[PDB]
Amino acid sequence: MKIWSKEEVVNKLHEIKNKGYLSVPTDMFRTDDGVVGQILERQFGVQENNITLGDLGEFELKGMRNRKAKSNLTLFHKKPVAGQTVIQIFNRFGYVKPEVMKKKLFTTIKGGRLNNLGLTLNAKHASEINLYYQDEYLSTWDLNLSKIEKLVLVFAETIGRANSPEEQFHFTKAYMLTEINDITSLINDGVLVMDLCIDQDLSKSKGPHDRGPHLRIPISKLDKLYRNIERLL
Template sequence: MNLKELVEKLQTIRDMGYVKALRRGNTGIGYTFESLIGLEETNIPIPDIGGRVEIKTTRKDSSSLVTLFTFNRGVWLKKQKEIIEQFGYEDEKGRKALKSTIFYNRPNSLGLYIDIDDSKNIIRLFSSNHELLAEWDVYVVVGVFSSKLSRLLFVLADRRTIRGQEEFHFNEAYLLTEPNPRNFLNAFKNSLVGIDLRMHLKENGTVRNRGTGFRMREKDMLELYGNKRNLL
């Protein structure tokens, strides 16, 4: 499929108006769109723009957060076990745990907060007593993001519910390329991207870290890219 053929398919789907969801729940929108466009995968090859393109679909009125990627390697400046013991709580399984999403300028209930060093392009995580716990190099973070989502077909839909049946109107689409470190920093500053801590202590006292996630609302992903091409 080339870009011209993709645009023609998108226009055909848009002109269908509201279509019934082919699956219930959060994944219904992606499954419905992929079925309409005739795909069995969440990415498509488009040679004339340089390779495979990931597909993301979202409801325009959705405010739920999604994990863009996880990244832990070499970021912790204090032992994770000590962090959990100092700031954690007992979770529903009786484990000492630390699970929280933290946004810039919005300290969480434990007093953990994010600061940004513009001159060095560093995102830092501090405790309530200003102890530095971890830091992420924005260029490394964007590199991880780019390796997963360097080219994105981003499709948005209005939705409605008729007699309990969800329906979608896929009427907005963008081709997003060139993830940008400066855009990523600005997204952090605007509290569009948050850092999601997801770790606990196992019975033997060792740390189980499911990966520190970078999370945002899907519809805000437009803000991360340097090149946005409107396809609809």
């Protein structure tokens, strides 16, 4: 595997910035989300969302649009490893509305407080996030501290409408984030936020459409998660 140096990363960041506004490659398969990171990876010449730096270790490579308004960094996008599945949560806590029925669970969940549905998060160690309804346990996600310990986060200015085929991206700022704080307090103080998003056309014979649970943190709160935030570009 390719080993990078920090200087190589910084040089690459400048190389990309110097190209100006980049278009979305058409040979690239795309879903509804993640285009910024896809382009960033292509510009780094890599096929995954991480790179290994010499003695410094493995860094996630993440891209975001630059916005004045609030935005969120995604920390994970995955299913629980134990307890109730996302579908079993959806079946129980989702609600029905109409023409003919559709069922839905679009909810945001934090530690420290129950939300409108009675749902909340708890951690005993950083390593693990548990979904409860009130004091009843439901499911568990693992948070891989090792994966998020070290991050190269790159911001793009854009022209054109977000997620359109004609959108263009100019990567102009980047940061190296390391030295991760104990996440227990960030979960239990409501800093890290989970979302569940599942719905279903109850007339049809198609299964539920689960967009996949996310754990996210506001960009404005990154200094609560990382003790060392260094501007690279």
